[PDB]
């Protein structure tokens, strides 16, 4: 009680001190400046909403004695929030419950009391037409319930709060979404509640109804308004279809919603990765290595362990499927001591020309490759290890026996070592002849690839592209032309005085 | 003082990285550590060391002796300012702030050095302060802070000639260019070996001779080797005291191929044990191999593969697997035959290989400017 009575009373007012300045500013700005004014010219409450997600992702941890969050819900749920003469008392009501926390004892919300903290779209003239107020005032209690999750009998409280937010969401889908950003502002709130929705209501229970309801939410997109419903409703569509085995990869090929037109650098950046693993499981033919690479390069700056360690793995999985491999051990910051050793230990065997060294990897870490689930892509690398081998030996040796290459490749059979070489001439790779009667495989010395018309194509790929980045440095450039206020010619008074001086020169 | 201060860090290397060899290094490193007032740089070296449980009074007598030098500075700063000389506060700790640089960490060094940098109006003190910042910039491997005071250093030598401040400086840029894997610049900073002196950091001049020959044997070709390191009287007589390095250098020059690997295991093994070559002993000899291979192999065309075992180095299958990874590695310009048992060569005109580095640098700078172009303007 001294240690609690001196360290517990300061964490109610200072979070109140900052939350009367951030999302009470969003309460005064996104309710009165998005529901009633234009927010397309000023949409800063979406990035402020990003701030009031990322702060509260790591703001709350404890079970909240001293009612430091447990007393916020009997405060923050009694909100009319209609107009300034009705919220002028509410600005006092941000203070009148501080006396309830400090002077008295409030309702300690500990896994049981979330029921009287949700049945307020009715208490004291509350509504639902102001869905910038009722979706933000839905999410503002819908987040901190589910931010720590509390999987002990809170799933139904979170569930019923999601049902009230589904009443706000059906009102969003049906009722008066024209020119108010009612749909646009709550596609971000809808999008962000799809992940708490999708981390209580996905892997516990029954996602396949959120499939049909999500195709209804995708159905109400693309007709009325062409933004914010084309973007999140496709990765949020994809994220368990990649974990499923339905045909929804070719539907994503023939989809019109593949471009949601500058999807905010966060869903768009990961979207290219999620469609990168699509052609991974459907046989990368070097098509999606640029979209995996682009999916890597459009990342922000937070951490790497969630997705970036897996695009740093899968991005050159698909190049190990090609035959090229960059070194992965680069900016050793968190990812290159923790999450490489089985997987760089994989490509160490691929960059060699050994056959069962690959097996010495794949018995050592077959289960770690099944921990993420890339194992069905790892299993087919023996083809590219042996094409690496036949390119290595066909490039190194010139007149080499077939009765040597099987033993050096520990193939244990020369009789198909004629045949791996045979398909190595079939598929392209190595060209020259085999003396099957003698045994030696001859290979010609092919030099002066210079005159052969490959490096003109290596030019021509990058000529037009460097002109493209020149053109982007031209087109992303003429917006700071602005405020060019007045190019005055000379003057008026000095021009009349110059005419008077020329008049004196004409009189003289 | 910072003049024996490189041997300290080299013996920290001798403590940490040889795992079995960590007993006499923590004996003599303590023999230097818990005297001469050293306080800060060995707490984590004590963590890598054993417990050494009662070090408390050992730290107390030396933070006390450190407090003595601190408080006599605190007895100097007010007498210095009463009747002022050339800012005698910063004239006292412009000399004792290097004592604070060794004893304290880099902070009481740096604020006093950038402090006293504005005091002396000539570079005769400034450039030595900057030499001190360079030397601690090696110590904490301050790879960004060395880039500043190298240019800020070199900006002072142009007025005057200052060859004890330029040729001495070239030793610092040479040790940086061999700290990084920049060998052709390391030997080029090690070009003179005449004005280079019986140093503090290489107290043997002959160790500097070994370093410049070990980098020069990669760094230059035969013309430079058949004029430069073979006709220098200043370079011959100092390896006249060396039996090994004289044989290790001349065996490549006298085409003594089989004995070259013998001293190659010696010099490479010493390079494995050595500080500052331990980052690149693995990269050194794999250059030495392909150099010694290409030198012999660009003489003949019809030279067989079972000739090099008895005349060059034993193990025919060892030569097989060693050349296969080099032709397959994309260098060592030849083409080996197998079952008629002969090694063929070719010759590439500088039209493809000179082009390969062009597409490398083009892809590098295209990655650079495209990455920056994605960064700026969102």
């Amino acid at each position: 009680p001294p240690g609690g009575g001196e360290q517990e009373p300061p964490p109610p007012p200072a979070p109140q001190d900052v939350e009367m300045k951030e999302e009470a500013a969003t309460g005064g700005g996104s309710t009165g400046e998005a529901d009633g004014k234009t927010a397309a010219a000023a949409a800063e409450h979406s990035q402020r909403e990003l701030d009031t997600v990322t702060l509260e992702d790591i703001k709350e941890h404890v079970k909240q004695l001293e009612k430091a969050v447990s007393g916020k819900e009997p405060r923050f749920v009694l909100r009319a929030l209609r107009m300034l003469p009705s919220t002028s008392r509410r600005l006092n009501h941000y203070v009148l419950y501080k006396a309830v926390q400090g002077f008295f004892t409030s309702n300690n919300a500990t896994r049981d009391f979330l029921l009287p903290f949700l049945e307020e779209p009715m208490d004291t003239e509350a509504d639902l037409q102001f869905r910038p107020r009722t979706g933000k005032a839905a999410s503002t209690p819908l987040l901190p319930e589910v931010e720590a999750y509390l999987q002990l009998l809170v799933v139904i409280f979170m569930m019923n709060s999601k049902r009230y937010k589904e009443a706000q969401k059906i009102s969003d889908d049906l009722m008066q979404k024209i020119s108010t950003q009612n749909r646009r502002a709550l596609d971000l709130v809808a999008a962000k509640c799809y992940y708490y929705h999708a981390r209580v209501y996905e892997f516990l229970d029954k996602l396949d109804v959120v499939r049909s309801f999500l195709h209804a939410r995708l159905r109400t997109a693309t007709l009325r308004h062409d933004a914010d419903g084309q973007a999140t409703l496709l990765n949020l569509l994809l994220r368990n279809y990649l974990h499923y085995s339905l045909y929804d990869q070719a539907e994503k090929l023939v989809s019109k919603s593949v471009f949601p037109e500058q999807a905010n650098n966060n869903e768009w950046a990961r979207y290219l990765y999620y469609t990168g693993r699509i052609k991974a499981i459907q046989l990368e033919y070097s098509e999606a290595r640029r979209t995996m690479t682009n999916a890597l390069r459009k990342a922000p700056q937070h951490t790497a362990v969630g997705f970036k360690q897996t695009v740093h793995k899968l991005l050159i999985v698909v190049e190990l499927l090609l035959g090229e491999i960059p070194d992965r051990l680069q900016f050793r910051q968190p990812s290159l001591k923790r999450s490489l050793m089985p997987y760089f230990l994989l490509t160490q065997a691929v960059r060699t020309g050994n056959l069962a060294k690959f097996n010495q990897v794949l018995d050592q870490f077959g289960e770690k490759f099944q921990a993420d689930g890339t194992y069905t892509l790892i299993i087919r690398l023996r083809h590219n290890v042996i094409k690496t081998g036949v390119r290595m030996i066909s490039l190194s040796y010139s007149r080499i026996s077939l009765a040597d290459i099987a033993q050096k490749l520990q193939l244990d059979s020369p009789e198909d070592a004629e045949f791996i070489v045979a398909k190595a001439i079939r598929d392209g790779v190595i060209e020259a002849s085999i003396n099957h009667e003698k045994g030696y495989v001859q290979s010609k010395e092919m030099i002066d690839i210079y005159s052969t018309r490959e490096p003109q194509l290596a030019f021509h790929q990058r000529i037009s592209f460097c002109l493209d980045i020149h053109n982007m440095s031209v087109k992303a450039m003429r917006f700071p032309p602005k405020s060019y206020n007045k190019d005055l010619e000379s003057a008026e008074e000095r021009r009349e005085r110059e005419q008077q001086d020329l008049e004196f020169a004409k009189e003289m | 003082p910072k003049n024996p201060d490189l041997r300290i860090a080299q013996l920290r290397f001798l403590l940490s990285l040889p795992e079995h060899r960590g007993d006499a290094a923590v004996r003599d490193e303590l023999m230097a550590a818990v005297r001469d007032n050293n306080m800060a740089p060995y707490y984590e070296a004590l963590c890598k060391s054993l417990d050494w449980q009662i070090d408390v009074d050992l730290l107390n007598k030396m933070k006390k002796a450190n407090e003595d030098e601190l408080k006599r500075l605190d007895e100097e700063l007010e007498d210095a300012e009463k009747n002022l000389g050339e800012s005698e506060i910063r004239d006292a700790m412009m000399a004792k702030a290097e004592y604070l640089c060794r004893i304290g960490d880099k902070e009481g060094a740096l604020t006093a050095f950038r402090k006293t940098y504005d005091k002396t109006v000539a570079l005769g003190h400034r450039l030595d302060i900057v030499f001190y910042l360079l030397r601690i910039g090696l110590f904490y491997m301050d790879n960004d802070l060395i880039t500043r005071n190298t240019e800020k250093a070199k900006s002072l030598i142009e007025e005057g000639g200052d060859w004890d401040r330029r040729n001495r400086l070239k030793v610092y840029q040479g040790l940086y260019c061999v700290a990084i894997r920049d060998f052709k610049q390391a030997a080029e900073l090690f070009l003179d070996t005449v004005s280079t002196f019986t140093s503090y950091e290489l107290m043997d001049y002959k160790t500097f001779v070994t370093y410049t020959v070990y980098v020069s044997m990669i760094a230059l070709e035969r013309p430079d080797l058949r004029e430069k390191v073979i006709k220098g009287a200043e370079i011959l007589e100092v390896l006249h005291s060396l039996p090994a390095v004289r044989q290790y250098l001349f065996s490549l020059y006298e085409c003594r191929y089989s004995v070259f690997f013998q001293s190659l295991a010696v010099v490479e093994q010493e390079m494995k044990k050595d500080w500052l070559f331990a980052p690149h002993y693995r990269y050194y000899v794999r250059e030495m191999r392909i150099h010694a291979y290409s030198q012999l192999l660009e003489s003949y065309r019809s030279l067989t593969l079972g000739y090099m075992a008895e005349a060059f180095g034993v193990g025919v299958e060892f030569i097989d697997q060693e050349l296969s990874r080099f032709i397959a590695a994309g260098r060592l310009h030849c083409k080996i035959d197998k079952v008629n048992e002969i090694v063929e060569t070719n010759r590439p005109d500088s039209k493809n290989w000179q082009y390969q580095e062009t597409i490398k640098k083009g892809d590098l700078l295209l990655n650079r400017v495209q990455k920056l172009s994605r960064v700026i303007n969102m």
Binding site: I463, L467, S473, K482, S483 | G362, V369, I376, N377
Partner: peptide, 30 residues
């Protein structure tokens, strides 16, 4: 390929010469 590689960098330097005319002008004048 060389001169084509130089030109885009030239216009990038010209872009930064315009962003310096954007951000240090909009706060000053308004």
């Amino acid at each position: 390929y060389l001169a084509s590689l130089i030109r885009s960098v030239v216009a990038l330097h010209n872009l930064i010469n315009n962003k310096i005319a954007n951000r240090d002008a909009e706060k000053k004048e308004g």
